[PDB]
Amino acid sequence: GTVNWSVEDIVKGINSNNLESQLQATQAARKLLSREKQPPIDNIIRAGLIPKFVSFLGKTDCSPIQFESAWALTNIASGTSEQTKAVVDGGAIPAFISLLASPHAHISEQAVWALGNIAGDGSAFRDLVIKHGAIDPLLALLAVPDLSTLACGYLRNLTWTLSNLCRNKNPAPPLDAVEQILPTLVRLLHHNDPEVLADSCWAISYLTDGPNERIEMVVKKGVVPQLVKLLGATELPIVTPALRAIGNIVTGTDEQTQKVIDAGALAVFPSLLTNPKTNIQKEATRTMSNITAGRQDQIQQVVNHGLVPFLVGVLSKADFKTQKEAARAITNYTSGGTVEQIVYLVHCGIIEPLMNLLSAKDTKIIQVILDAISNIFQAAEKLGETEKLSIMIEECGGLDKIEALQRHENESVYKASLNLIEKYF
């Protein structure tokens, strides 16, 4: 019926003076733009059809052509940036915002998904969508006493579109818009659908990926305990953004980092630091390295939760990028820790796997490991136990590796290497 039309036939119908013929052809356009293999988006754009689709968005008297053109436009705007720009340049943004008020749920849903695709393309279109007024009508679609009375697909699409309005930097979204959306996000973060929860966590992770004032807007709304709960979810699409958000929050102040600790986050890290998905392990170890760069009482809480062995574990055997983050976590720990805390670190077995990593290609990890070694010796000096430590390092191949590093391309590597050797060997 409307199956496998040519662009030429689509054009001939859309240019007829016949609203039913126009509807037929708009639907044929939607079906073309919907096919899995290589939809002819650019042919459709080249034919000049975007303006005609956009004009059909306003035919309130013919809601099916509103729907078909909204869905055709949506498949264009989900493409490449130039394709999305063709939709924006056709005037689609305010036409879609108007359709958020449609009494046809399936039409306003299409308008939600179209605006998510436009806003997601980047910061400028994100802010343009906001400037045309999309936030109020979007949030009004969620102003119901129980989100569970909304259709599942519809709620998922609203959540996803809201997260794209939270997305991207340079610049980050307008402060007034974030404050407007955050209360709804907080509510979505307590909805029991795994996808709503994933996308809510993604939104929070974007908002926390910034300076400490942005983090504070989020932490003030009280979401950290819920984020930590979601950190323990079974569904990886939830854990991944929950962990990204928590990882972001601990790049902030000590007081913001403390909320994460107070909320119980550290009790999940035994699993996170052994997780079979390499990105979860990397991200969890980076989060640990930010925490070990905090106050001594915060280092102590890493200690008390039994996490130092897990860091020894990750340093010993992990993806190389994860071993690198774990090396940072140890250097931070030894820079900021008490002597007693550094003793404990050595007793858990950090020295051997530290040494074994000195034979790595990365110049930066070598710098990091050498710093930590120096910090450990500085703790040994305060106990006059440098000798017992030099033996340890001599006993697990450590000393061979350091002698060799005096002859190293980088300056800082040469210097620190030969310094340690003269000072303690």
Query: In angstroms, what is the resolution?
Result: 2.3
Which string of DSSP letters, residue by residue, matches 5-30?
Answer: --HHHHHHHHTSS-HHHHHHHHHHHH
| CATH number, position 324 | 1.25.10.10
**Structural domain of 18:** 1-425
Cis peptide preceding 171, ω within 30 of 0: yes
Domain count, the chain: 1
Task: Give the DSSP per-residue string, 339-405.
Answer: HHHHHHHHHTT-HHHHHHGGG-S-HHHHHHHHHHHHHHHHHHHTTT-HHHHHHHHHHTTHHHHHHHH
220-227 long-range contacts (CB < 8 A, ≥24 apart) are: 221/182, 221/183, 221/186, 222/186, 223/186, 223/189, 224/249, 224/259, 224/260, 224/263, 225/263, 225/264, 226/189, 226/190, 227/189, 227/201, 227/263
Indicate which technique resolved this structure.
Answer: X-ray
Cα–Cα nearest to 101, from 134, 126, 78 = 134
Specify whether the CB–CB gap between 293 and 336 falls below 8 A.
yes
Q: In which residue are the tokens 């599942």 written?
A: 152
